[PDB]
Write a protein that binds this ligand. Structure first.
Ligand code: MG
Ligand code: MG
Ligand code: MG
Ligand code: MG
Ligand code: MG
Ligand code: MG
Ligand code: MG
Ligand code: MG
Ligand code: MG
Ligand code: MG
Ligand code: MG
Ligand code: MG
Ligand code: MG
Ligand code: MG
Ligand code: MG
Ligand code: MG
Ligand code: MG
Ligand code: MG
Ligand code: MG
Ligand code: MG
Ligand code: MG
Ligand code: MG
Ligand code: MG
Ligand code: MG
Ligand code: MG
Ligand code: MG
Ligand code: MG
Ligand code: MG
Ligand code: MG
Ligand code: MG
Ligand code: MG
Ligand code: MG
Ligand code: MG
Ligand code: MG
Ligand code: MG
Ligand code: MG
Ligand code: MG
Ligand code: MG
Ligand code: MG
Ligand code: MG
Ligand code: MG
Ligand code: MG
Ligand code: MG
Ligand code: MG
Ligand code: MG
Ligand code: MG
Ligand code: MG
Ligand code: ZN
Lengths: 206, 24, 60, 155, 118, 80, 127, 98
RNA sequence: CGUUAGUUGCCAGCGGUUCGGCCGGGCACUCUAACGGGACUGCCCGCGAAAGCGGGAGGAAGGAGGGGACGACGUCUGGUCAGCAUGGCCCUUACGGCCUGGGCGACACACGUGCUACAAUGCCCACUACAAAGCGAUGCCACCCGGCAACGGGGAGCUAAUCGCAAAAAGGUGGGCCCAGUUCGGAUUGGGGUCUGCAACCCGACCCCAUGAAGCCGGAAUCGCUAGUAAUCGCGGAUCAGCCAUGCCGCGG
């Protein structure tokens, strides 16, 4: 029991907040709730599109939600069809009359949560985990990414004994807060039980 | 000592006011 | 906790003293910070995730 | 101190006598971090010793400390089962603290009501060869020369 | 000097000397010394019998005191004891009354520790 | 040391019940789960079953006990 | 004409205004001894003058706020020595060995979780 | 009298929002008092690190609200010309009181 | 230490004064909070092959300056399915669902952690001086009146470097106590009462009267701390209508 969260470590420098706005004593409570309804609802609909981060900004009653997706085409739909359905569904939950933006993510293999999702997807389909891990490390390592690390939690391959897997490559120095280590977590649910997937990507120096 | 509630120091210990420790 | 114990959300408590905090995310009964509406656990989880604006790592 | 020598702290010279031995003694009197209380006790006790006796409280303070300094003490060393009382010399630094501590401890076993009254009288007795602090010193010097049979265990 | 039902404090300050009376604490002594117009710092042995009799006149019948107080309180217990009151039951079994915890540290009320085996 | 400071509280359940019982004469045992309430002078002479959480215990209400609350005579704990 | 130094000790500041004069010292509109004098170490603030024998040369007007009175006395000890160097920078070679111009950076150690007061650990039994 | 109270959790957001306001008013108004910073309201939250004790392992966080003041003296139009809606920053919050 | 910045700051400087930074006024200073500078064994002596060690000057600061955040491959089948998520297995007029009441506070005992003390370097009373960090929109409540008081009425200010919690306590000067189960010690208990709350019997805190216990430095054993440290003193906060907080997390003397 050690190794505190890397993103929670880096929120000050080399990482920003997924929500950037201001509130008061009588405001912050519900505004934070609205942010969690938003990220909650997107992950339901937008999992197939491959979203990575949901960024919610507010100036005054305006909501600047930005979704970073690997395939922005699944988001927009044909001729702007699905960016109509679920974007009006967004202003129905919260009456803030909120507008929506989309952003492309180059190299989905370079976004840690996306790499985690990809591994968990394969685990739900029961592939070889050590290969799926080492394969996942190559997809990250073969494009920039001076470091990479992948962890898979217990019940590996549906084993009765819980295990822990491995195979980082390069350099993943979590102890230093300098070089913008990305982090993501996936959850693979299966018949034998639950599996966690931790993804570490290392890129840049200062 | 601090335990006697009708002494001035026992009043400040609990953080209360009364005849033995007025306000002003 | 239990789904029936989130009856605080529908409160109409019939007495104003029966209202309690009830962390919204996990349904925590016991320890709920009033400013975030989140329990100490949810608060710690959401803070690491960076979904709480302005919340840093206290160090001094 | 397993690594270093554990260098000695350098106390501030006294505000009145400019003497460090006085400031260290005032500290031994201080309890619960009330140094302003301790100094007033020690300095009022200088009035008692300078009036009831017509000498310098500076010289008697030093003269009292010198008489309580033990030249030898005993320490325990594990040898073949149960340990022994082993006499050995006292470090000049240790003679500093021991005499001061004994002087303050002996003065509080005194009968006198007020603190400064006990201090001045104890210092007066200690300077004259009597008093409770000198008894502890003499009793320690009795432990040495008694177990002197173990003088081969010096270490 | 006898003030209340037989009560003889001596040689100390009067205000403190009255605390030796049963129905008198520091509060009622400072009040008697006040309304009687008597210096509280004066020694008991230096008290004028004229200031003594005035103290007696006030204190004797202003509040119920040693004899009557002991009975009144003792009659105040039998009262809540003769009724089936819970507070009286806590007095019967010699246990705390104000609603403390009895699992530990009841020693004052409970007749200090009488140990059993384990 | 006991203080309600004004409007000495008695639950409305038994209050409207006992005063109407006085109009028709002294009645028999009564059901009471409200030990929150105090005792008022017009209760003297009745018999009230107060709940322990388990059982209903008949309590004869007298003059000396007017100042107290129901449940003071209906204890909860069971020891020895 | 006039000379100044700041000085600081343990969350306390003391503005030292040294002017040539009779030697009388003013603190917060009060005499030096009406603020102190019940405080034995008070005289240690004026030691920078006695090292250079500046007792009777200068008056003083001092404004003190922050911390407790003891840290103020040291805060005054530095402000007197800081101004005294601005008057004559040759006074540095005399003032330096005594260390009256050295700031004391010892500050209250922050209280730490798991302990009671920043070092003191809760006692345990093991049985 | 025109007061402008700047508030936000990011100290770089305020200064980026404050300097853009002064560079618009200084081309028109008199000498502006300046970016006078107000102290920070620090709310601290100490939470036990894990659930289900190990009480003595807690870690704490701090949310800091920085504040700023502007005080444009005698602005008329060319100050308010550039002051309608030109600002980029988001995490900032502004108030106005006359 | 400087730069930027001045409605906390100031007869440093004059002007005015109801002598209160109060006004006039100014940013120098204290300060506040953003960016920078600063320390590198760089300089000298000595040792050494080197890394480095010893000492010295200059310096606010030196050999990691002080304190944090940070805890590696793994270990203990460690802890928690009762925060959450969850495989499998059971329950379904019921293990589920509502309510009132009671319990989680029980007491012949034991251990743990703490609080308060056994006192004269102390206690009580009056008087008076010096902190830092936080909290507050029906919440903080100056101030006035009532009341011994808890508190109530009235009511000013404060979206708060501007108003309020607020008094810091030890300390200082003055006075009382004179070694005595007491002017130490505040347990227990009778009685009277404020406040929150639908509601204080189980089972609240607070005030006032009276009661005034054990305890006169603790057996074997055992704990913390190496410098603003231990010891001691008070202050604030989180949760919370209230509060059993002596706990916890911070703050400075
Ligand atoms: Mg596999
Ligand atoms: Mg990094
Ligand atoms: Mg007392
Ligand atoms: Mg569940
Ligand atoms: Mg509640
Ligand atoms: Mg052996
Ligand atoms: Mg209790
Ligand atoms: Mg039996
Ligand atoms: Mg000049
Ligand atoms: Mg600190
Ligand atoms: Mg401390
Ligand atoms: Mg333990
Ligand atoms: Mg804990
Ligand atoms: Mg500066
Ligand atoms: Mg200002
Ligand atoms: Mg000045
Ligand atoms: Mg003029
Ligand atoms: Mg004028
Ligand atoms: Mg004027
Ligand atoms: Mg006036
Ligand atoms: Mg004046
Ligand atoms: Mg005034
Ligand atoms: Mg004006
Ligand atoms: Mg003007
Ligand atoms: Mg060296
Ligand atoms: Mg050096
Ligand atoms: Mg080294
Ligand atoms: Mg360090
Ligand atoms: Mg490191
Ligand atoms: Mg097990
Ligand atoms: Mg385990
Ligand atoms: Mg319990
Ligand atoms: Mg039995
Ligand atoms: Mg104990
Ligand atoms: Mg009045
Ligand atoms: Mg301001
Ligand atoms: Mg102001
Ligand atoms: Mg303002
Ligand atoms: Mg005030
Ligand atoms: Mg005195
Ligand atoms: Mg006894
Ligand atoms: Mg007594
Ligand atoms: Mg005694
Ligand atoms: Mg250490
Ligand atoms: Mg509270
Ligand atoms: Mg209310
Ligand atoms: Mg407290
Ligand atoms: Zn939660």
């Amino acid at each position: 029991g050690n190794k505190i969260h890397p993103i929670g470590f880096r929120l000050g420098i080399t990482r920003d907040w997924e929500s950037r706005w201001y509130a008061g004593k009588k405001q912050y409570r519900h505004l934070l709730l609205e942010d969690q309804r938003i990220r909650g609802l997107l992950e339901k609909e937008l999992y197939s599109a491959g979203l990575a981060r949901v960024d919610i900004e507010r100036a005054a009653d305006n909501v600047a939600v930005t979704v970073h997706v690997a395939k922005p085409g699944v988001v927009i739909g044909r001729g702007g069809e699905r960016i109509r359905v679920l974007r009006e569904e967004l202003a129905k939950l919260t009456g803030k009359n909120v507008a929506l933006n989309v952003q492309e993510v180059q190299n989905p293999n370079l976004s840690a949560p996306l790499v985690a999702q990809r591994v968990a997807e394969q685990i739900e389909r029961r592939f070889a985990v050590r290969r799926a891990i080492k394969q996942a490390v190559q997809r990250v390592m073969e494009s920039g990414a001076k470091g990479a690390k992948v962890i898979v939690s217990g019940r590996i391959g549906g084993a009765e004994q819980a295990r822990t897997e491995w195979a980082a490559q390069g350099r993943v120095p979590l102890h230093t807060l300098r070089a913008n280590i990305d982090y993501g977590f996936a959850l693979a649910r299966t018949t034998y039980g639950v599996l966690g997937v931790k993804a570490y990507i290392f890129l840049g120096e200062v | 000592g601090k335990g006697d509630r009708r002494t001035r120091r026992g009043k400040i210990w609990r953080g209360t006011y009364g005849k033995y420790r007025p306000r002003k | 906790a239990r789904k029936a114990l989130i009856e605080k959300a529908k409160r109409t408590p019939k007495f104003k003293v029966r209202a309690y905090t009830r962390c919204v995310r996990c349904g925590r009964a016991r320890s709920v910070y009033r400013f975030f509406g989140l329990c100490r656990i949810c608060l710690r989880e959401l803070a690491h995730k960076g979904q709480l604006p302005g919340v840093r790592k206290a160090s001094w | 101190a397993r690594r270093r020598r554990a260098e000695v702290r350098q106390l501030q010279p006294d505000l009145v006598y400019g003497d460090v031995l006085v400031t260290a003694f005032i500290n031994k009197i201080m309890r619960d971090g009330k140094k302003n209380l301790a100094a007033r006790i020690f300095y009022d006790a200088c009035k008692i010793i300078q009036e009831k006796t017509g000498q310098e409280p500076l010289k008697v303070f030093k003269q009292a400390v010198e008489n309580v300094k033990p030249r030898m003490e005993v320490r325990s060393r594990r040898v073949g089962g149960a340990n022994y009382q082993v006499p050995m010399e006292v470090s000049p630094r240790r003679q500093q603290s021991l005499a001061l501590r004994w002087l303050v401890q002996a003065a509080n076993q005194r009968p006198e009501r007020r603190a400064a009254v006990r201090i001045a009288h104890e210092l007066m007795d200690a300077a004259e060869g009597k008093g409770g602090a000198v008894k502890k010193k003499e009793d320690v010097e009795r432990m040495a020369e008694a177990n002197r049979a173990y003088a081969h265990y010096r270490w | 000097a006898r003030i209340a039902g037989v009560e003889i404090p001596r040689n100390k300050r009067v205000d403190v000397a009255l605390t030796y009376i049963y129905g008198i604490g520091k509060a009622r002594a400072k009040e008697a010394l006040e309304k009687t117009g008597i210096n509280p710092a004066t020694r008991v042995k230096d008290l004028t019998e004229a200031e003594v009799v005035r103290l007696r006149e006030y204190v004797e019948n202003t509040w119920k005191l040693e004899g009557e107080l002991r009975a009144e309180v003792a009659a105040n217990i039998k009262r809540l004891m003769d009724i089936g009151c819970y507070r009286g039951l806590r007095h019967r079994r010699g246990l705390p009354v104000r609603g403390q915890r009895t699992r530990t540290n009841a020693r004052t009320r409970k007749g200090p520790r009488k140990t059993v085996a384990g | 040391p006991r203080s309600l400071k004004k409007g000495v509280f008695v639950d409305d359940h038994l209050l409207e019940k006992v005063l109407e019982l006085n109009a028709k004469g002294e009645k028999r045992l009564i059901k009471t789960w409200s030990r929150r309430s105090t005792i008022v002078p017009e209760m003297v002479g009745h018999t009230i079953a107060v709940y322990n959480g388990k059982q209903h215990v008949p309590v004869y209400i007298t003059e000396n006990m007017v100042g107290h609350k129901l449940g003071e005579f209906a204890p909860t704990r069971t020891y020895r | 004409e006039q000379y100044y130094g700041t000085g600081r000790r343990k969350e306390a500041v003391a503005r030292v205004f040294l002017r040539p004069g009779n030697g009388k010292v003013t603190v917060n509109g009060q005499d030096f001894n009406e603020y102190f004098q019940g405080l034995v170490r008070a005289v240690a603030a004026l030691e920078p003058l006695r090292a250079v024998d500046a007792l009777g040369h200068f008056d003083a007007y001092i404004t003190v706020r922050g911390g407790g009175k003891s840290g103020q006395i040291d805060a005054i000890k530095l402000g007197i020595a800081r101004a005294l160097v601005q008057y004559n920078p040759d006074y540095r070679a005399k003032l330096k060995p005594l260390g009256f111009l050295t700031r004391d950076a010892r500050v209250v150690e922050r209280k730490k979780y798991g302990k009671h007061k920043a070092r003191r650990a809760p006692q345990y039994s093991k049985r | 009298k025109i007061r402008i109270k700047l508030r936000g959790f990011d100290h770089k957001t305020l200064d980026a929002s404050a300097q853009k306001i002064v560079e618009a008013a200084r081309r028109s108004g008199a000498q502006v008092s300046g970016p006078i910073p107000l102290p920070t309201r620090v709310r601290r939250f100490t939470v036990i690190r894990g659930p289900f004790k190990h009480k003595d392992s807690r870690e704490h966080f701090e949310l800091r609200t920085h504040n700023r003041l502007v005080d444009i003296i005698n602005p008329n139009r060319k100050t308010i010309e550039q002051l309608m809606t030109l600002d980029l920053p988001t995490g900032v919050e502004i108030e106005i009181k006359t």
